[PDB]
Amino acid sequence: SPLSPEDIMRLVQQHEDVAAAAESEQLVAQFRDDPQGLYEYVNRAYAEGPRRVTTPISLLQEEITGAVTESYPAAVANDIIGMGSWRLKDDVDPVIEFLVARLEGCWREILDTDLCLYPREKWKEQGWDLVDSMDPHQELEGFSYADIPDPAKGEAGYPRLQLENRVYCSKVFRKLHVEVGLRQDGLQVLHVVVYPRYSYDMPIFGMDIVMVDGRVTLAVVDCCPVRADLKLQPHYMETMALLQRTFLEGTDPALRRIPEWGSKIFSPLALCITPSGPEELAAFAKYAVALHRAYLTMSLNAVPVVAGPGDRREAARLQEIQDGQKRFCDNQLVNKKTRRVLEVAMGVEWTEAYMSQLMFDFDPKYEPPYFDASFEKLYTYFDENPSFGEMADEAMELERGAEAER
Amino acid sequence: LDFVTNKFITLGYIAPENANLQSELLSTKEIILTNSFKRF
Amino acid sequence: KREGVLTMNLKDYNILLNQVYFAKSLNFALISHSKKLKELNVSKKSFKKKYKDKAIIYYEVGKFVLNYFLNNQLT
Amino acid sequence: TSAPFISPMTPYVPEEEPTRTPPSIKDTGTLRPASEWYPQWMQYRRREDNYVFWQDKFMRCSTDIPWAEKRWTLFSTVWYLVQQLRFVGTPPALRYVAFLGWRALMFQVYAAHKALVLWQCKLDAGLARIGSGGATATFSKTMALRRLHWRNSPLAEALYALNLYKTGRVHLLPPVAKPIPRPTFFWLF
Amino acid sequence: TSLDGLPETQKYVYADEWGFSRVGADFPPGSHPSLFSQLLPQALFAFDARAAVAAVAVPLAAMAAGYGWLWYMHSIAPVWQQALCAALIGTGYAGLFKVAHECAMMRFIPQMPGLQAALGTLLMAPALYSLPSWRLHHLHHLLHTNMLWQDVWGWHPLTKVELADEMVRSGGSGGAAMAAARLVLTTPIKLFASVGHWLRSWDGLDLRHFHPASYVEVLSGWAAPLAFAGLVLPAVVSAGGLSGFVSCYLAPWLVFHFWLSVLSLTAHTAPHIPWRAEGDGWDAGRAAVAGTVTLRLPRPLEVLLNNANYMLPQAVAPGLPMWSAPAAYAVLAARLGPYLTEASMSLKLLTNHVTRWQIYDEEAHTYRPMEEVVDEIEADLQQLAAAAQQ
Amino acid sequence: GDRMSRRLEDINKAERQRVWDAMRVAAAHRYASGQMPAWFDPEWLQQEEAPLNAMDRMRGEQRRIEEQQQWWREDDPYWPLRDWGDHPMRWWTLAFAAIMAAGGLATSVATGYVEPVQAGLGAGALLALAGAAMSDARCVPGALGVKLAWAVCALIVLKEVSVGWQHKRKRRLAASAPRLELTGLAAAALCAGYMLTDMSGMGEVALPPNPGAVFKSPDVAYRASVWQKWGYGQVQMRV
Amino acid sequence: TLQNERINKQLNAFL
Amino acid sequence: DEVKKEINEIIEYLRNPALLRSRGVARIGGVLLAGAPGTGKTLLAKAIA
Amino acid sequence: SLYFVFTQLNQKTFLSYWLLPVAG
Amino acid sequence: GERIWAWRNRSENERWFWEVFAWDRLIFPILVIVAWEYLVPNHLVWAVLAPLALLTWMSGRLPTPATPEFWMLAYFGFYRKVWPDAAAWLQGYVVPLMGFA
Ligand SMILES: CC(C)CCC[C@@H](C)[C@H]1CC[C@H]2[C@@H]3CC=C4C[C@@H](OC(=O)CCC(=O)O)CC[C@]4(C)[C@H]3CC[C@]12C
Ligand SMILES: CC(C)CCC[C@@H](C)[C@H]1CC[C@H]2[C@@H]3CC=C4C[C@@H](OC(=O)CCC(=O)O)CC[C@]4(C)[C@H]3CC[C@]12C
């Protein structure tokens, strides 16, 4: 009947395990019922129509002259914008256009209260926001994509290489990075990666598309685990499984080979594909968009792990997080494909610096700041449920009491 | 530009055909512009 | 319960006056009028519209971005 | 810090409405009377710059009154009778005679106060000697001018005297006195 | 715990040497008291009006009896009759104060929160205590139980190091603070040191310690004591003069403070209970389970105090109502048996608390008498003075 | 000009502040009664300044501090004249409360009269409460505290100089006349100290406006409202 | 038996 | 309909002037009826009365 | 919506004054 | 002249009070009612009923419990002229119609 000096610890373990399980289940409860809503949100938002704005100023306006003010949800707005103001559009294959538009739309729509731009001295003053091989010193001030015509075969320059990057910081993510590259021989790459801050226990999100002459030759998407055992939390595995059952069903199960280099960083549910026709590509695209959106929405409610004086478990957790992110960075650096397509065009002393400082940098002693602008939500609120000051109350009781005589 | 445009669309704007019969900014839009200039 | 406070910025009523009456005045009648309105109220072509709306929005976004920059940041 | 979002390095002190109209433009800080009609500095300025005379009159008399000088309270409906006697029930000739007398009195009082201020300057210049024990014999002209314009509270004077007596240090001055706000109670006053 | 692995013989000789019945073994680290709330049957949390009205009416009857007697024989009675009526009134009020402490933690009548707030305020006022401040100090105590340098709302012990520092500053053992400590923790007045607690509430009457959003609630809390001491303590005096004050108010007040102080002091202090600093091995569950002592009284006293001695159960299940505290303890004693400590209120216990355990030294991590400790650290003062030769 | 620019900047500053305060009040109300959209964090009600004005102030101040740097306490003797966050007349109020209470109890025990202790302890309770509220002078309770203390000291002065004290009766008639002694003098000094430090809060409580105040006002709705309240709702507004 | 269990679990979470 | 709006003011001044003072309109003392040739101005006066 | 105030009482006639001397 | 202008812009409420409200609507009706009830024997037609008619005719509105005229009439007239004998009438003739003695 009495208890033992050990089974107390058994009780502690069981309690914290049931707590973790409960919260992980609560996280998936939202996607579980209807997974299709992770890709079909734009179509539904379009279906519901343009909302009418009811704020005192707009009501007074549309009553005075005629002018009705209309609004649109965030999904429709980021669908109207599209590949908004990228300077290298008009050169991008429509598939890469679609994917970039969707990914940046989810960033701007979900993280909008804390999304900042990465510090400008780290990438944007070195001239890394738009890179051209025919002008490696920026003596045309970044208009080389328009001033210099494409070199013909055999001339000094063939083939030309162009890159464009965008880097953001946020509250949970220390870096959200999207980069597009074009080469004259008919090659186009797209590379997206999302790193959580050094104090959050989340996997790293990653996507790569490589298409040649309009045909997608390689496509890989995965949530690379960050722990030492290559094991995600329960809810990440559950969501990936549910989404693969939803979108990828009826497609190739044997084409999902695992690259030799990913075998040390990939999760057991990574997706690598050389698509066959249009249906495979459509399935993969829907799946990638849905997976990204689910990942961001589950990040919306993350809490850091803090190291308390005396606690060793949290120190161990922090060290494991740091080492997992570093392992990902150093094992991505030897993906020799992009490395060589860079270095055979821009040199090597440039390539090493660029790949070290921007693509896969890892310095735990520096993570960029952010700017929390949540107070904005107050202002918007109080412009549609306003309050009028103590003298409109008399006028309104007069209006009611005199109108109610009918 | 992309960010401020997304916000302005989701706030509200006078459609060209709805209006039959913006020289200055409202106050919510001024909060939004100041913040966007501070972040980006 | 009940709060008597005016959470509206007067600059907005002034902006609306300028708009509708130069292209009555700022008194209590205007504010109670807006309260009356709010109370009684709360009781192919797709792509063409996309192009039109994108153009219209980007116009004014750029106009105000340059205004703000020149006035409050060049200094 | 309380500030959830934004906090500069110096905490924000909530400033409130002013409760009294500023000293006019014609007055000085001291006790000696003003100038009957036109100030003396007006003669050393451009004719198109002396419009601030009448503008200040307009501001104090009609357009900038702080809503705290317009409170209706039980004290003010009796002060109304005092003032209405002085303005409508007394002939302007007797008021003029009283005005002349009061001017002469204020000139005598100002002369006395200036004498006292100079005396205080010697006294504290002497006290700084005890304080430093050795050489220091000067005083502070800043403190003399601040004493003449009534810009010190009595506590500041006492603390300055003590600082002088203990460590010399004639150039360490108390901060400055802030103006007294208008006292209000309720419907009462 | 201080007495780690060792046979039952030394445990029991320590037990009957210090007056405890069952000493405690050793609890594992890394836990929390809220764990063992799962060992409790769910029927213990049920509300019933019977025990409620009984708990609010028995101490009221004892108080009324004492007062009726005392007034029937106002000042013609000798001092022992006065002492006995004062003791009875003080105990009755300690019972009503336990009820008020229950209403402060929101676990007496949760269905009517306004009524239980008003009741707690009313019952706390006559002792000149505030309800919101009491809630705050008690929560802060539960969060920091036995934490060295942090549990300021409990019987924080006088450590050797701060005493040595004060003796180095005083230049001898004759200063004012010295003699103050000397009489406060060497004489039976220690059994009233709770009055010091009373003065440390009213945190300077300073609204700058609290969160602004609560000012109006804190101010109201301070106005119920004051109103009492502003409307009722006059009447008493005016209607009975100094004597009619010292027998109708001051003696029950001193008795109530005796009860408060002895309860708390016995609860969380014993030679085998260490006071670990923060970061240096302080554990929450270890301090709330192993570092607690349960006092046993005669059942008449218990039913008069509303089971005010049973403190361990309501630290593992903070919502457990007052009338289920005895029963619940019997449950925990079955499962947490080997780790608990228990004692019976006897003269030996209080004599030990007064004469023996006075200073807490952390190197030996135990309590030692004040006089031997001070003369020892003074001999080491002489020896460091000899070490100060050059 | 560079003069109308200053006026414009001050108008914008003041309007932004007034609107932030109205939002805070209305949000406190809507939150205390349930109706709030659950992304709302009740700590946003402790930000007093405004987000916009705070950002402007921060930027300007950092620009200044950047481009410009291209008993007795010997270290700072003037510590009493430093904004510590309370009212200046806060320890005097508690001191006077303690004096009143002690003196009242001592007197009423030494003689047998029951008015000294009642008045002394009543005033002591009220003045201790006021001196507790006066420990944060920016709030609304920080101002109601000053008002309460002034009221109590004025009542003490009145009872002393107009009715006198019961335990001070004599056999004669001019020997027992109500005069000002030492308690009334201390209370009068306190009242003067409250008035000459700060008692300017809650200035919007007065007698309501007349039809005489709104004769020249530029508002027809407001004038009509006032006329209605005072009993002239039927008069013709030839304005 | 629920009004006390609610309070119990809330206080436990906080603590 | 536009003058429906414009003359629901005269109607409400005739029924209930206190409500029309709350809208910023002190008094309506004299109105003009202009328009195109031959609009039948006598007809609407009947209706409003 | 009114206040608690008397009404004028002499806008119609003057007879009321006849009570002030007589009572006096 | 300037001093008068400044003072007149700060004293509009008190000016209207002393010019239009002090006598006509505060002191005159009080004096009138007290003076009427000083004369005029302790009847009922004279203490309550006739003042009601004359006040209604003079002021132009019937006094109801919402107005101070009703309460002044009530207190002075009724409570100090008609009550001290209607009380005896009731205490002699209507309490025996109930149980209490
Ligand atoms: C007089 C009897 C009959 C009624 C009970 C009176 C109590 C309500 C009073 C008397 C003792 C007072 C306390 C005495 C000491 C202090 C400290 C004092 O603050 C300080 O001393 C602050 C720190 C410092 O001064 O250094 C004011 C609050 C407090 C708790 C007082 C609060 C009000 C108390 C409890
Ligand atoms: C000149 C000295 C001797 C005395 C001054 C008297 C006036 C200042 C008082 C006496 C009668 C008062 C009136 C009596 C009745 C009322 C109704 C009452 O109305 C309110 O409840 C207004 C408060 C609000 O809701 O805003 C208080 C204001 C008012 C008009 C009072 C305004 C101030 C008056 C004129």
Nearest 5°: phi and psi at A193? -150, 145
Under 8 Å between Cβ of F122 and F104 = no
Q: Max CA-CA distance within chain H? A: 36
Residue listed under structure tokens 């009534």 = D150
Cα-to-centroid distance, E157 and ligand 1 (Å): 24
Q: Identify the CA nearest to J63 among candidates A164, E150, I4, A167.
A: I4
Within an 8 Å CB–CB cutoff, is residue C29 touching chain H? Answer: yes
Residue nearest to atom 12 of ligand 1 (CA): E199
Beta strands in H1-49 (DSSP E): none
Distance in Å, alpha carbon of A25 to nearest chain F alpha carbon: 22
DSSP type of residue C33: H
3-state secondary structure J26-81: HHHHHHHHHHHHHCCCCCCHHHHHHHHHHHHHHHCCCCCCCCHHHHHHHHHHHHHH
Within an 8 Å CB–CB cutoff, is residue I13 touching chain J? Answer: yes
For residue A159, is the peptide bond before it cis, meaning its omega torsion is within 30 degrees of 0?
yes
Cα-to-centroid distance, A63 and ligand 2 (Å): 42
> Dihedral through CA I4, CA I8, CA I9, CA I14, nearest 10?
160
Distance from the first to the final alpha carbon of chain B: 9
Under 8 Å between Cβ of E220 and E120 = no
Q: Which residues of H touch A399 (CB under 8 A)?
A: 19
Under 8 Å between Cβ of C4 and A367 = no
Is the CA virtual torsion A231, A232, A233, A234 positive or negative?
negative
Residue nearest to atom 4 of ligand 2 (CA): D74
Distance in Å, alpha carbon of C34 to nearest chain A alpha carbon: 6
DSSP type of residue E189: G
Distance from the first to the final alpha carbon of chain F: 38
* Three-class SS state of C74: coil
Cβ separation J39–I12 shorter than 8 A: no
**Could you tell me which residues come within 8 angstroms of residue F71 by beta carbon, excluding any fewer than 6 positions away?**
none
- Calculate the alpha carbon distances from A308 to A162, A199, A317, E281, G13 in Å: 48, 13, 12, 13, 19
What six digits make up the tokens of A371? Answer: 């700017």
Residue nearest to atom 19 of ligand 1 (CA): E204
Cβ separation G4–E321 shorter than 8 A: yes
Out of J28, J35, J38, whose CB is closest to I9?
A: J28
Beta strand pairing status for E293-296 and E341-344?
A: parallel
Under 8 Å between Cβ of E2 and E366 = yes
For residues A175-187, b (16+ Cβ closer than 10 Å) or e, as one string? bbbbbbbbbbeeb
What is the full DSSP assignment across A146-184? HHSPPPPTTSTTPSPEEEEEEEEE-SSEEEEEEEEEEET
- Calculate the alpha carbon distances from D173 to D126, D157, D168, F46 in Å: 17, 9, 12, 36
Q: Method used for this model? A: cryo-EM
> Dihedral through CA A113, CA A118, CA A120, CA A122, nearest 10?
160
Under 8 Å between Cβ of E129 and E258 = no
Cα distance between residue A19 and residue G12, in whole Å: 14
What six digits make up the tokens of A361? Answer: 């940098």
What six digits make up the tokens of E273? Answer: 């209970």
> Dihedral through CA E374, CA E380, CA E386, CA E388, nearest 10?
-90
Under 8 Å between Cβ of A90 and B29 = no
Within an 8 Å CB–CB cutoff, is residue I5 touching chain J? Answer: yes
DSSP type of residue E159: B
Residue D87: CB atoms within 10 Å = 14
3-state secondary structure chain F: CCCHHHHHHHHHHHHHHHHHHHHHHHHHHHHHCCCCCCCCCHHHHHCCCCHHHHHHHHHHHHHHHHHCCCCCCCCCCCCCCCCCCCCHHHHHHHHHHHHHHHHHHHHHHHCCCCHHHHHHHHHHHHHHHHHHHCCCCCCCHHHHHHHHHHHHHHHHHHHHHHHCCHHHCCCCCCCCCCCCCCHHHHHHHHHHHHHCCCCCCCCCCCCCCCCCCCCCCCCHHHHHHHHHHHCCCCCCCCC
A218 forms beta bridges with A210
- Please give the distance of CA E12 from its chain centroid, rounded to a whole number: 26
Subunits adjacent to chain J (3 or more Cβ pairs under 8 Å): D, F, I
Residue nearest to atom 6 of ligand 2 (CA): D74
Distance in Å, alpha carbon of J69 to nearest chain F alpha carbon: 15
Cα distance between residue J50 and residue J53, in whole Å: 5
For residues F78-98, b (16+ Cβ closer than 10 Å) or e, as one string? beebeeeebbbbbebbbebbe
Among residues 329-388 of chain A, which lie with CB inside 8 Å of chain D?
A: 372, 374-375
Nearest 5°: phi and psi at E342? -140, 155
Cα distance between residue A336 and residue A332, in whole Å: 9
Ligand 2 atom closest to the Cα of residue F208 is 26
Distance in Å, alpha carbon of B4 to nearest chain C alpha carbon: 7
**Could you tell me which residues come within 8 angstroms of residue E28 by beta carbon, excluding any fewer than 6 positions away?**
A5, A6, A8, A9, E286
- Please give the distance of CA C31 from its chain centroid, rounded to a whole number: 15
Residue listed under structure tokens 């007074």 = A60
Residue nearest to atom 27 of ligand 1 (CA): E204
Mutate to test the pocket of ligand 1, among E130, E133, E199, E201 (most ligand atoms within 8 A of CB): E199
A94 forms beta bridges with none
Out of C23, C56, C68, whose CB is closest to B37?
A: C68
Helix F183-195, helix F91-110: angle, nearest 10: 160
Nearest 5°: phi and psi at E10? -70, -35
Nearest 5°: phi and psi at F43? -80, -15
What six digits make up the tokens of A399? Answer: 């209006």
Nearest 5°: phi and psi at B37? -70, -30
Q: How many CA atoms lie within 13 A of H12 on its CB side?
A: 18
In chain H, DSSP finds a helix count (H) and a strand count (E) of 3, 0
Q: What amino acid occupies position E155? A: W
What six digits make up the tokens of A319? Answer: 């060290």
Q: What amino acid occupies position D83? A: Q
* Three-class SS state of D108: helix
Q: Best mutation site among A59, A76, A381 for testing chain C: the one with the most C CBs within 10 Å?
A: A59
Out of C12, C58, C73, whose CB is closest to B26?
A: C12
Q: Find the helix or strand (DSSP H, E) in which E54 lies.
A: helix E49-72
Residue A309: CB atoms within 10 Å = 7
Q: Which residues of F touch H18 (CB under 8 A)?
A: 224, 228, 233
Under 8 Å between Cβ of E26 and E338 = no
Q: How many CA atoms lie within 13 A of A264 on its CB side?
A: 12
Residue nearest to atom 30 of ligand 2 (CA): I3
E354 φψ region: left (φ > 0), alpha (ψ -120 to 50), beta (else): alpha
Residue nearest to atom 11 of ligand 1 (CA): E199
Q: Which residues of B touch C12 (CB under 8 A)?
A: 26-27
**Could you tell me which residues come within 8 angstroms of residue D187 by beta carbon, excluding any fewer than 6 positions away?**
D73, D74, F205, F206, F207
Q: Is E205 a pocket residue for ligand 1 (Cβ < 6 Å)?
A: yes
Q: Which residues of A touch C55 (CB under 8 A)?
A: none
If 0-12 CB within 10 Å is exposed, 13-18 middle and 19+ buried, where does residue J13 land?
buried
Ligand nearest to the CA of J23: 2
Opening angle at CA A197, ends A333 and A259, nearest 5: 35
What is the full DSSP assignment across E262-314? HHHHHHT--TT-----TTTT--HHIIIIIT-EEEE--HHHHHHHTSTT--SHH
- Calculate the alpha carbon distances from A77 to A55, A377, B28, I13 in Å: 20, 18, 18, 76
Cβ separation F228–I1 shorter than 8 A: yes
Cβ separation H19–A398 shorter than 8 A: yes
Q: Identify the CA nearest to A205 among candidates A149, A284, A144, A267.
A: A267
Cα distance between residue F219 and residue F239, in whole Å: 11
Q: Max CA-CA distance within chain F? A: 83
What six digits make up the tokens of F64? Answer: 């200044």
Under 8 Å between Cβ of F207 and J13 = yes
Mutate to test the pocket of ligand 1, among E124, E201, E202 (most ligand atoms within 8 A of CB): E202
Question: Which residues have any ligand 2 atom within 6 Å of their CB?
Answer: D 74, 77; F 207-208; I 3-5
* Three-class SS state of E25: coil
> Dihedral through CA A47, CA A53, CA A59, CA A61, nearest 10?
-90
Within an 8 Å CB–CB cutoff, is residue A395 touching chain C? Answer: yes
**Could you tell me which residues come within 8 angstroms of residue E236 by beta carbon, excluding any fewer than 6 positions away?**
E244, E245, E248, E249
- Please give the distance of CA E310 from its chain centroid, rounded to a whole number: 12
Under 8 Å between Cβ of A287 and A221 = yes
Under 8 Å between Cβ of C7 and F22 = yes
Ligand 2 atom closest to the Cα of residue D72 is 8
For residues A122-132, b (16+ Cβ closer than 10 Å) or e, as one string? ebeeeebbbbb
Cα distance between residue D15 and residue A167, in whole Å: 42
**Could you tell me which residues come within 8 angstroms of residue B2 by beta carbon, excluding any fewer than 6 positions away?**
A81, A84, A85, A104, A108
Cα distance between residue E46 and residue E324, in whole Å: 9
Cα distance between residue B40 and residue E237, in whole Å: 73
Opening angle at CA A23, ends A20 and A29, nearest 5: 140
Cα distance between residue A292 and residue A190, in whole Å: 15
What six digits make up the tokens of F146? Answer: 């000053």
Under 8 Å between Cβ of F239 and F220 = yes
What is the full DSSP assignment across I3-19? -S----S-SS-SGGGGH
Under 8 Å between Cβ of E82 and E247 = yes
Beta strand pairing status for A187-196 and A204-212?
A: antiparallel
Cα distance between residue D65 and residue D61, in whole Å: 8
What is the full DSSP assignment across A15-83? HHHHHHHHHHHHHHHHHHH-GGGGTTHHHHHHHH-PEEP--HHHHHHHHHS---EEE--HHHHHHHH-S
Within an 8 Å CB–CB cutoff, is residue H23 touching chain C? Answer: yes
* Three-class SS state of D53: helix
Q: Identify the CA nearest to A288 among candidates A77, A40, A39.
A: A39
Q: Find the helix or strand (DSSP H, E) in which A271 lies.
A: strand A271-273
Nearest 5°: phi and psi at D108? -60, -45
* Three-class SS state of D160: helix
* Three-class SS state of A272: strand
What six digits make up the tokens of E271? Answer: 């030679």
Helix F4-32, helix F51-67: angle, nearest 10: 130
Subunits adjacent to chain A (3 or more Cβ pairs under 8 Å): B, C, D, E, F, H
Distance in Å, alpha carbon of A84 to nearest chain C alpha carbon: 10
Under 8 Å between Cβ of A293 and A106 = yes
